[PDB]
Structure formats: structure tokens, C-alpha cells
Amino acid sequence: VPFVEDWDLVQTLGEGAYGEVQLAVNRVTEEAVAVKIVDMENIKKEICINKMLNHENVVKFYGHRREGNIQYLFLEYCSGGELFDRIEPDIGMPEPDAQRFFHQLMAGVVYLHGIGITHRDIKPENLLLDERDNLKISDFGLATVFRYNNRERLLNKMCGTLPYVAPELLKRREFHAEPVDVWSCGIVLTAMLAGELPWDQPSDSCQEYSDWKEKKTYLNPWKKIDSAPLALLHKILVENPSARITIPDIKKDRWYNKPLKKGAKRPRVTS
Numbered sequence: 001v002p003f004v005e006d007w008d009l010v011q012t013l014g015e016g017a018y019g020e021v022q023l024a025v026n027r028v029t030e031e032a033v034a035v036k037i038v039d040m041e042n043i044k045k046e047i048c049i050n051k052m053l054n055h056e057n058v059v060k061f062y063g064h065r066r067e068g069n070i071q072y073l074f075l076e077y078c079s080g081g082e083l084f085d086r087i088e089p090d091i092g093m094p095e096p097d098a099q100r101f102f103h104q105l106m107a108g109v110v111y112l113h114g115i116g117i118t119h120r121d122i123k124p125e126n127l128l129l130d131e132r133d134n135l136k137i138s139d140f141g142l143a144t145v146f147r148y149n150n151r152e153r154l155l156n157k158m159c160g161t162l163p164y165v166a167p168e169l170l171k172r173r174e175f176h177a178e179p180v181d182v183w184s185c186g187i188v189l190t191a192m193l194a195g196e197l198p199w200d201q202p203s204d205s206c207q208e209y210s211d212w213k214e215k216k217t218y219l220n221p222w223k224k225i226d227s228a229p230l231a232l233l234h235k236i237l238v239e240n241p242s243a244r245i246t247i248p249d250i251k252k253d254r255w256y257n258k259p260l261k262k263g264a265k266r267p268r269v270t271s
Ligand SMILES: COc1cc(OC)c(NC(=O)Nc2cnccn2)cc1Cl
Pocket: 013, 014, 015, 021, 034, 036, 059, 075, 076, 077, 078, 079, 080, 081, 082, 128, 138, 139
């Protein structure tokens, strides 16, 4: 079929340091995909990691094209935008919505860790939503392989965003990959339930971080979070990464398994 390979760039979705994310519409089919334009090894890893990924809660990779020194990454379009924009400042969002997003985030991270990939920069800006509000993990620019040939490799590289980084990244030379992603998911859950970030960074110099370790939960943001999801945050936001809760145990948590959310409103008539 002629002209099926032609895609029109119709709007700027976002703009980062690596470049810009454009909305691309197929000339013939009108299928919408997002195109990440990277004006360049840094992207060669993002492409390689993206070729491995195939999960309903992970942004799909369709292919890539190189036009000189510019790389075009054909990625899944998520019309719902960023999870960040669904968080009302100093409020958050209704608890059943946050539980559904946290469930979908856990399915995505279980999958990633299961194939030996660590995202290393989980935050609401990178958690995208489709037309049906299905969460998708995006941007594998900071991601890496932590398990290869069933052998785990300890990480040492400084990566992420300070309010979401685990404290062992600032205190230890080496650390396990999986508890780092579990921690950032915990900060994401906190943000969704309180509409604010607990601390600038997880260090003792940060009074908000010291207060959390001293269990001063009568203070913000913890005061806004109900006891059942707060009990889960007490297990995620544990300084020692070896004592920190694992995802198989997050799935057994009381709040995680608490019925709260109704299914998508389906059409109905009376009489
Ligand atoms: C602010 O609105 C948006 C922002 C977006 O990205 C920054 C998108 N993008 C989107 O759906 N695709 C995407 C972006 N980065 C990596 C992988 N996939 C959609 C919307 Cl609607």
C-alpha cells in the first residue's frame, strides 16, 4: 500500500535534554504513535533495552530510524498523558485511583525485574496513561541490565531524581538494583495520596527525612494518608535496602489487596 510508511509530526508532546517527543500520525491509517527525537551509546542502550520489552504496563517500542546524527524512536502513544498531571497539588487523588495505578505500576516493575531490567528513574513524569487510564512505564534512557545469565550485578552509578532516589545510593558505593525501584514506587504512591513529595533527598541533613525515621506521622504528608496505605509506606520507605519490602510481599500487603475501586463505568439502561 503506498504512503503507509509516512508519518506526520502534528504536535509537541514533551521536551527533554535528549530532545523532544512528538505526536506522529500515519498518513494512510491515522494510527498515532509518539516519536522521541534524539539529536546525538546513551541512545544505543535505550534502543537495545526497548527491543526486549513487551508488557501491557510498559510503553511499547515499534522501531527506530536514523537520519544522519538524529535518532527517531517510534514509541507507544499514551493520550492520557503523565500521571504527574493527575496529582492535585497538596491533595493527590482519590485512594481507589492511586491503588489501581499502584497495581499497574507493580505489574510493570515485576515484569521489568523478571527480565533483569531496572528502570532507575521511576517518577509520575515517566508514568504515562493510555485512553483507558492504563499506566505505562516510559523512558528507558537511564535503565540498565542488573541480571544476566541468572547472575546479579550490583550497581554503583548515580542515577535518578533526588526526591525519588533510595538512601543507599547516597550512602553506599554498591547497592542492589531491585530495592531502588521499590523505593521510587513508594515515593510515587506517597505523591498520589498526599499531592506532595516527603523530602528533597533521603539524607539525615533533610529534617523531613529524619522525622519519618522518628515515625512523626502526625506531620505532612503522612497525616493525609490513611493508616492502611501508610502501613505499606512504612514497609517500602525502610532505609536499609535488605530489610525493605520486596514486590512479592507488596502483593500480600493488606491495603494492596483491599477492595476500593469499581471497574470502568459500562453503559446500562433501566426497565
Ligand atoms: C503532556 O502530554 C503527553 C506527554 C507525553 O510524553 C512526554 C506523551 N507521550 C507518549 O504518549 N509517548 C511516550 C513518551 N516518552 C516515551 C515513550 N512514549 C503523551 C502525552 Cl498526551
